[PDB]
Amino acid sequence: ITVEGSMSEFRNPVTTLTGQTVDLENYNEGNTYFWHAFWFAIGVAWIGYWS
Amino acid sequence: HGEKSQAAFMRMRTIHWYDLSWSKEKVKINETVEIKGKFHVFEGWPETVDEPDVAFLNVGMPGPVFIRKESYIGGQLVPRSVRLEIGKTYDFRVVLKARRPGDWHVHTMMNVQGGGPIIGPGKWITVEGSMSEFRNPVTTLTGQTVDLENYNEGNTYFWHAFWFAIGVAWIGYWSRRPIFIPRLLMVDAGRADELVSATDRKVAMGFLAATILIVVMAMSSANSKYPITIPLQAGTMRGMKPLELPAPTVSVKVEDATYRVPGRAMRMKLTITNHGNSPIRLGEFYTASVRFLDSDVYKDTTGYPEDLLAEDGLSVSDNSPLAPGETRTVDVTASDAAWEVYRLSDIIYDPDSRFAGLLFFFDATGNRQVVQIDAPLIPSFM
Amino acid sequence: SWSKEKVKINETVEIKGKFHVFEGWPETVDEPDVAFLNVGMPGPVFIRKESY
Amino acid sequence: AVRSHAEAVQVSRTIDWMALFVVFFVIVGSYHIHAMLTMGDWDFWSDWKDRRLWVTVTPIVLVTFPAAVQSYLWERYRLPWGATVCVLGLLLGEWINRYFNFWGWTYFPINFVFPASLVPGAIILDTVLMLSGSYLFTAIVGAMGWGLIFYPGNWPIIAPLHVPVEYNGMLMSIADIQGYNYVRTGTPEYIRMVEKGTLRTFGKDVAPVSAFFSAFMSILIYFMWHFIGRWFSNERFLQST
Amino acid sequence: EWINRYFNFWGWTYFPINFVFPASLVPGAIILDTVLMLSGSYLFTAIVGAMGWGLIFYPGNWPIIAPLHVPVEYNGMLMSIADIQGYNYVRTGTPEYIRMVEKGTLRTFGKDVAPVSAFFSAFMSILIYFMWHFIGRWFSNERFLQST
Amino acid sequence: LLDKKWLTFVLEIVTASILWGYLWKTRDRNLAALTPREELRRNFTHLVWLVAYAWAIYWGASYFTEQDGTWLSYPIYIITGFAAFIYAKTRLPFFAKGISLPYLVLVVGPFMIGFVIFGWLALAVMGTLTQTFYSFAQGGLGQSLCE
Amino acid sequence: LLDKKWLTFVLEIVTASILWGYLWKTRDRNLAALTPREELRRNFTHLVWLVAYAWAIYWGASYFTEQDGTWLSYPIYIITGFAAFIYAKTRLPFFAKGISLPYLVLVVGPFMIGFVIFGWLALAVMGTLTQTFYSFAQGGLGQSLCE
Ligand SMILES: [Cu+2]
Ligand SMILES: [Cu+2]
Ligand SMILES: [Cu+2]
């Protein structure tokens, strides 16, 4: 099967039972990055404090 | 009361009990209470619970307040593990004999090999009298009548007390002398070789010989008395008869199902297909030990428990008689306080939001037909 | 049905019949989901040329 | 320090009694945990008290603490009743709980929920431990005695419960009838790991074969738990936890 | 985990990051280390810090996985956002049935799937910490063999 | 005098706080200046704690664990065991200047109480008991015993 | 000088042959006549091999093992580890006259890499690292450190 176009145009919307429409391509990605980077920063800060 | 504590979806689609009938509500000691009914093993048996390839029909009470005198599934006695087929319908019959006065439950429940208890609906039964009047006679094949309430109790006490007395006598014999500190000091400070000596060795040989000889003589006596004995009988019974229910003439397909969170109502949409030559009306929706009934079409007269009975809890938007061959789509709402009392609203917390139940269709003639439904259950919040 | 009662070397003996697997198969024995039709003799005094 | 000889002996006696109390009750608690969390199902019920699984399992998992307590008490005080005290403590806990909770709160009959008897096995173990004090001879012969005499030890108690009965058209034992009558919500029949038959049993050999298997595995468990108790008997003083 | 997610899961294949994000263990590690230092006794560490590691693992990742647990009606059957992601983004080697996840049980009572699992993980983590402390102690030796 | 009749004689968390705190703050710093006569009087009280510990283990691991089998005490015996540990470590000689391995195992195992592996840790009572006997046989060994 | 910029800086079987052979043939026989100053210069190069070994283990056991999870390096880090072993044993004192058990385990485990049991053998890097620190603290211990 041949697919033409660009990945940037792709969209995967979905509507939750709570009542909002979210895009699964970028849903929760910001929160995931924020929390993982925050915990990694805390770990690196501790290791640097003792280093 | 283990029911309700279990997962809502697991309770709804494991086993369905219907046509339950208790012989009596209030009895006295030594009287018999008979529980009859049919249970249908659901086709969509959950994967997490092992199939009832080896299952046992139990009865749930807080301790042996009733002795299970008899228990039949179909027409044969089932006192040991049995094999159930998925989707088949069986009829069971349990005879209970009152033993302890007070108010008790019953729970038409069961036990499966890899899932443990499956509690069915239970009814309060009051017992009057005194425990001293209770009797459980039984006649052995050897030819004597014995009372299981006090059979072998004297022999059990005698032998256990005798062996405990021998043990205590030995420990006291070696405890009359000073025990811990002097003996530890003597054994540490070089060779002791004085804490154990004649005639302690002689008396311990006496103890060992007496123990072995007493065991052998007691075994011989228990082989002289009671000369006929058999091993314990066990083994799953197969080839077990289910009910040959006629093929239902009513086809119901569920288009979505919802329940208010929080709420006490379950709303679902049905497409009833009618066959045969009779006008049918939906009369009862049995989901998990809870009977939602429509008073305008059917009323319960079997003494079903009040907390599990919804006399007008089943509301149908268009409950007019359905002509044969004609199919219509109607919204069915089953609302009762029991839906939250027995924790049927925690299916949202359960990891499989699918329900199953039985629909009972009645006609003007009077006879009823059972059809089964199973559809995903979609909670709603706004 | 056994084809012959007394035979000589290199001769063929044929055993025919029907076996019925009981409905009440005991639980302690695993179901014959994988079973093999053997023939019991004290060592290969007969070679199982064929088995159907 | 100490005043005189006689009151020193009195102090030694008081310490003996207090130490016997503490060791006895700690052993009761721990070994009761071990029994009920490794074996308890069979011991609860007469119909569970079969001849294959009961006879096999109970000595194997109940030689554990007696081995360790012998390894300590004999080696440290020449006191040949470690197995006996362990067994007496288990029996005391079993019986008080049967009489006060099984028959007290619930009403399971005593002849139905009676526990097993292990005093003959304990006595053989202790006497073999003392006479010819070698621990290896103990683990070889006394462990076999413990395994072998367990079933004939309880036979005078369970023999009256094995009388055949025709119960509603199907054959039953008195123990089977008791289990069928007195309902057990948490312990259904199918959980009964009991003798359910086999195509590899020949004649009257269910009990002797199980007894001998229990004896050999009890030899092994005694040998392991003797060293476990020997390790538990150390006096090491750590300096840095 | 993160470099491989970003360069291989999202680089060669195109599994979304919010779908193939790894777990977070920094809170557990921090509790373990601080309990190790404060009251430096290894046994108190294995008893309390291991419990902290086991217990805070799920609430540690909860801020990340909570938005993925919003219920959705997906083609007539109830689903989570994570379930929809797994259903959509196909995994040739990891089908749904391999998912050893909470599939229900007749021996669970109420809202106790997570706390019971958390406490079981905490206790078995105590045991594994106690074992691996001695394993690492053995691995820390300075022995010089003379004959291999 | 010597041994007295002590032998005859949210909340759980609170009770452990004061009982451990009161016992640990009241430790004797000058342990060397300790006469053997008062040692034996003090050394009995440690055995009383062990007796109270055996009672609590028995009341917790026997009457209550199988009680669920027919179907508080764990914190009670936890507190009793740790209190006995602190009492031994602080008040007694031959228990200070080091943590006793069997005593620590006996205190911790039932505390941390899959419980089959943990219930064996109560067998450390044997090492505890031999250590307590050695503590007794320090000044009051003789003269009488071994004679 | 001391440490230089080495830190910035069929075929697999062949490469191991020369690299082990060249390193083993070029071993210093007169190890005793070795000044501490040149030791530290030589002792850094051993640490460079360990750093190259950690890079190779990381590049082999992290980027490439899970690479199949989404679905050369093993021989590369095998060669690097055995080369570091030979370098330590030959050139360095405190590593000769005996095979280091943790160093041998660290070299062999990942080499022999069911791999769960074998991946723990890379924890021997802790014993390797403490041994390397002891090797550093032979002549260059002071004066400065511990003062
Ligand atoms: Cu109930
Ligand atoms: Cu059904
Ligand atoms: Cu047949």
Rounded to 5 degrees, what angle do the CA atoms B158, D218, D220 make? 165
A48 at the B interface (CB within 8 A)? no
Beta strands in E7-101, from DSSP E residues, in sequence order: 71-74, 77-80
Interface check for C43 against chain B (CB to CB < 8 A): the answer is: no
**Secondary element (H or E) of residue D179:** helix D174-181
The dihedral over CA atoms of G140, G145, G146, G147, expressed in degrees to the nearest 10, equals 120
- Are B158 and B38 contained in the same domain? no
Residues B144 and B211 reside in one and the same domain: yes
Asked whether residue B335 falls in the same domain as residue B191, the answer is: no
Answer whether D23's CB lies under 8 Å from B203's CB. Answer: no
B246, B268, B288 — which closes off a domain?
A: B246
Same-domain check for residues B63 and B17:
yes
**Segment (H or E) for B341:** helix B338-341
Q: Is F36 on the interface with D (CB under 8 A)?
A: yes
Give me the long-range contacts of E125-128 (CB less than 8 A, separation at least 24). E125/E50, E125/E51, E125/E53, E125/E54, E126/E46, E126/E47, E126/E50, E126/E51, E126/E54, E126/F112
Q: Are B60 and B119 in contact (CB under 8 A)?
A: yes
End position of a domain, from candidates B232, B267, B300: B232
Same structural domain, B47 and B96: yes
Q: What are phi and psi of C15, to 5 degrees?
A: -110, 120
Q: What's the total number of domains in chain B?
A: 3
Residues B186, B210, single domain; the answer is yes
Report how many domains make up chain E: 1
Cβ neighbours for D225, distance < 8 A, ≥ 6 positions apart: D63, D64, D65, D67, D68, D71
The CATH number linked to B370 is 2.60.40.1580
In B, which residues are within 8 Å of F133 by CB distance? 180-181, 184
Range of the domain at B48: 1-135+233-246
This structure was determined by cryo-EM
Check whether residue B283 and residue B372 sit in a common domain.
Answer: yes
F133 with B180: Cβ contact below 8 A:
yes
DSSP string, B70-104: EEEETTEE--S-B---TT-EEEEEEEEEE-S-EEE
**Cα dist from D188 to B13, B54, D48, D193, whole Å:** 21, 11, 11, 11
B203 in the same domain as B86: no
Instruction: State phi, psi for G80 to the nearest 5 degrees.
Output: -65, -45
Identify whether residues B112 and B153 lie together within a single domain: no
The first and second tokens of residue B282, run together, are 């939906």
CATH number where B169 lies: 1.10.287.710
CB B236 within 8 A of CB B354: no
Name the residue with tokens 């000689």.
F93
Chain D residue numbers with beta carbons less than 8 Å from the beta carbon of E43 are 241
**Domain CATH code at residue D218:** 1.20.1450.10
Q: Which domain holds residue D93?
A: 1-238
**Residues for chain C: how many in total?**
52
Q: Are residues B218 and B318 in the same domain?
A: no
Please report which residue ranges of chain G form alpha helices under DSSP H: 11-25, 36-61, 65-70, 73-91, 101-112, 115-119, 125-136
Same domain, B129 and B99: yes
E92 touches G: beta carbon within 8 Å: no
Distance (Å) from the C-alpha of residue D230 to the closest C-alpha of chain B?
A: 16
Neighboring chain F residues of D96 at a CB cutoff of 8 Å:
63
Q: Which residues of E24-50 are buried (b: 16+ CB within 10 A; e: fewer)?
A: bbbbbbbbbbebeeeeebbbebbbbbb
HSE at residue B271, side-chain half, CA atoms within 13 A, is 5
Q: Give the Cα separation of D147 and D145 in Å (integer).
A: 5
Which phi and psi angles does G61 have, rounded to 5°? -95, 0
* B275 annotated ligand binder: no
Give the C-alpha separation, F12 to E45, whole Å: 22
Neighboring chains of D (3 or more beta-carbon pairs < 8 A): B, C, E, F
Distance CA B304, CA E113 (A): 33
